[PDB]
Design a binder for this molecule. Structure first.
Ligand SMILES: CC(C)CCC[C@@H](C)[C@H]1CC[C@H]2[C@@H]3CC=C4C[C@@H](OC(=O)CCC(=O)O)CC[C@]4(C)[C@H]3CC[C@]12C
Ligand SMILES: CC(C)CCC[C@@H](C)[C@H]1CC[C@H]2[C@@H]3CC=C4C[C@@H](OC(=O)CCC(=O)O)CC[C@]4(C)[C@H]3CC[C@]12C
Ligand SMILES: CC(C)CCC[C@@H](C)[C@H]1CC[C@H]2[C@@H]3CC=C4C[C@@H](OC(=O)CCC(=O)O)CC[C@]4(C)[C@H]3CC[C@]12C
Ligand SMILES: [Cl-]
Ligand SMILES: [Cl-]
Ligand SMILES: [Cl-]
Ligand SMILES: [Cl-]
Ligand SMILES: [Cl-]
Ligand SMILES: [Cl-]
Lengths: 318, 318, 318
């Protein structure tokens, strides 16, 4: 009935809509293969702050939710679906950490190693606790895959090359089982808003994160980064082709969780253009970046215009 | 009751018996490690034409089947087993495309790129349609594995090295799930003609096709091509050892679908001899090629002598 | 009722407690990264003989068991759990073969190839027979994984580099399915002595054996050996963290089968220190070796003091 009680966790995904984008506009300002466009770095300055403000506000309201109604938090945690959203704040904070604007650090040779330890203490603690709790047959909504690759990226950025290999191995081990189990029962059309958002978006995006983590850790675009990227591209093509355009769709706030895969799948190709200099690669990167940015912007406008003039966004007594 | 109605799709496999062989006799005429044998290229000329004629005749009779009795085609398509034979004509045509005799093209530096696009338009269309139809728990008789590796070979031959990597990645992704699911319930003895031919032959042959596609695309026999080939060899050894010779077997026209794996597993070793010059490798390649050719020839003679003098080959009202 | 009838097969695991250790004390006497410690080779001399004596005695009593009560052997073999112990003698003998003290062979450039063939005749025969018997849905207690990597190590030591690749490929193929199937139902706490010892120890140790076999066969610590080792380390960390220390545990003779994984996971890190010269790697190797040796010694003392003064070690009429 009150505002605090009627608050879904999916609001974390809203941050995932923006923070990942904050990465891409940095790459377009520093990509050696995209110097034809005069993309000023100032475009990155007015996105990182917005993402940080959104994260701060959402974390604030969630903490105010926990301090008052603990029974709601306990009920939400003990769910077969909503567990995957408990890794969201760490991932969003890590994506914000990677994309610091150049103005803050004139010489960012290496970031201080405190942030990585601070952000992987609780992450491994929560992951181990969740896995142990669930272990005591569909092990697809209780294992984390995306966080390991982002952590490998962060560790490589900090300066611990050796550490990031462990995270990459753990992420690969956790991803193989999920890919084996889930692919046989992949959701069909007219099921995107059918209470599966925390699961099927971070399964077509993790293949792309590996293509970035491996390239960052090794520095050479070998065959390892040229296969996971193509697997992600094939999945993207399958989703684009199989969807039913004739049936159509209706607006939902839950669509914000499906913008992360296509947003993180364009930095992969913009970092792939650097390896193979050619017209098709640059055209593909540009068109994917354009469509991702346009969809993000139109979704933001729609959710802004559907929240203030009308007060029907928040469901009551879920 | 009539000839047109009583016509199984497995006739496509007959082409798979010959066209793949047309590849091998080309390799034996150009293998640098098999120049001791004075294998004239003329042996390849009188096999490619035969395979093309067989394909033309079988395609003709199948088209005449479709134009008259559409209900039979609809019933055959909506089956849990017979779907896998709907990828056969494209694979056979592609194998015929790879093994063009040298006489036709005096300087075959690169084939024209039209053929690959013409042959992968419908192939991807059909694969996507079939997967989407089945998705809407044994996902082993509705996914294609062999076609991707042959397409990678064809794309590498044409001149698009970059394209063939995508097909290789897709084939690997589709093969891993099939290998995981099927290996736990591998068919036992006295079950080869038990209505499973479209499935278990293209599971012990796809591991060998990768060893050829990777070598062709990269040009160096690295460790990637030295593991899938050994997996295929181990599967071959298991089939040879476990089969019950005491029980015996009876002649069946359906045996023509099991000659493709051993035929395509000998070009792998004849292209593996080129990497490691040694007596055991050459002996293994020669003996596998000999046994495959002998079995193909004896099967052809048996099916020819069991078709004209006696009119009991075609079952009535399946 | 009699001694011969009341004899479990798990006694083979006792040899696995010692023979693997005989390897480690050899490495500490020859590791270029552990020359600070003045570890004399004499420590290896008084362990290999002990392991050989234990193996001889246990094999003797098991043969005397088979010659008298064949029905007991038949009943033990036809069990859903006890099959995995039928590969133990070959593995222990192979581990004894690898760790021959230097004094016996002044110039051990290459071992004679007879031993490998003698030890892989029966091994492949038994593996194929067991797989064929079981095939005619939890395929986790009838497939062998560890033996292939040890065989690859032995073949590389003998001088047949090419042969050991086949064993590595077979081991990888058999391990992938086991890892996929078993990881979803990994045993929880208070279940280590719950009649699962032949299964869950050789699943957290096989990942480490690959890191040694690949390094031995190729001679360069590439990325292949730096991922399976980390997977094994992650599994080790998960076991250490998740176990319930508050509940405690009671002594059991069956604990001897769980000392093999941590014993074979320390030679991996002592051979990993040679690739990356650094303080953390050496400290990790030293502490793992110390804890493994201490646990082995305390378990041996406990099982010696629980066998002679008290006669309650052997259960009657299992
Ligand atoms: C969707 C993603 C996140 C899951 C991971 C899929 C893997 C099964 C793929 C991705 C990268 C692929 C590997 C990429 C790099 C190599 C090394 C590669 O080396 C070469 O490229 C040949 C010679 C050279 O250039 O070094 C040989 C194949 C192999 C092992 C590939 C095998 C299959 C791998 C491991
Ligand atoms: C039956 C087939 C079709 C399925 C594919 C099985 C894969 C799981 C195998 C086949 C090739 C193997 C890879 C082959 C090549 C490499 C790179 C390889 O590089 C080396 O050979 C070491 C140093 C060098 O020579 O480069 C390290 C292991 C690895 C990744 C192997 C890991 C396991 C792979 C991917
Ligand atoms: C727990 C174990 C026993 C199961 C095996 C897990 C595999 C899926 C892992 C282990 C080694 C990994 C491979 C290790 C070596 C390579 C080649 C590697 O080459 C590089 O390291 C980049 C450039 C170079 O240094 O050669 C690229 C990734 C890849 C294929 C890795 C992909 C994933 C592999 C095959
Ligand atoms: Cl970036
Ligand atoms: Cl996740
Ligand atoms: Cl060829
Ligand atoms: Cl297929
Ligand atoms: Cl050793
Ligand atoms: Cl085992």
């Amino acid at each position: 009935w009150p505002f605090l009680l009627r608050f879904p966790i999916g609001c974390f995904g809203i941050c995932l809509g923006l923070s990942s984008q904050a990465v891409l506009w940095l790459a377009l300002a520093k990509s050696p293969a995209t110097n034809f466009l005069h993309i000023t770095p100032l475009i990155n300055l007015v996105v990182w702050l917005f993402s940080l403000v959104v994260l701060v506000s959402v974390s604030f309201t969630y903490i105010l939710k926990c301090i008052f109604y603990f029974e709601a938090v306990k009920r939400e945690y003990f769910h077969p679906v909503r567990v995957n959203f408990f890794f969201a704040p760490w991932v969003v904070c890590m994506f914000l950490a990677i994309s610091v604007p150049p103005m803050f650090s004139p010489n960012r040779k290496y970031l201080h190693p405190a942030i990585w330890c601070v952000f992987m203490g609780p992450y491994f603690f929560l992951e181990l606790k969740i896995y142990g709790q669930w272990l005591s047959a569909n092990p697809s909504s209780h294992l984390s895959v995306v966080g390991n690759f982002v952590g490998a990226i962060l560790a490589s950025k900090v300066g611990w090359d050796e550490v990031a290999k462990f995270l990459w191995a753990v992420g690969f081990a956790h991803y193989l089982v999920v890919f084996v189990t889930l692919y046989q029962r992949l959701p069909t059309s007219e099921a995107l808003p059918k209470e599966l958002h925390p699961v099927y978006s971070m399964f077509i995006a993790a293949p792309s994160a590996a293509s970035i983590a491996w390239n960052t850790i090794y520095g050479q675009f070998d065959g390892c980064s040229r296969t996971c990227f193509f697997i992600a591209l094939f999945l993207y093509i399958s989703l684009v082709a199989r969807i039913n355009f004739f049936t159509g769709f209706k607006f939902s706030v839950a669509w914000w969780s499906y913008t992360f895969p296509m947003t993180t799948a364009s930095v992969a190709t913009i970092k792939y253009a650097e390896a193979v200099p050619g017209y098709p690669s640059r055209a593909l990167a540009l068109t994917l970046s354009f469509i991702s940015t346009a969809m993000v912007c139109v979704l933001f406008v729609s959710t802004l215009l559907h929240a203030f003039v009308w007060q029907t966004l928040f469901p009551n007594d879920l």
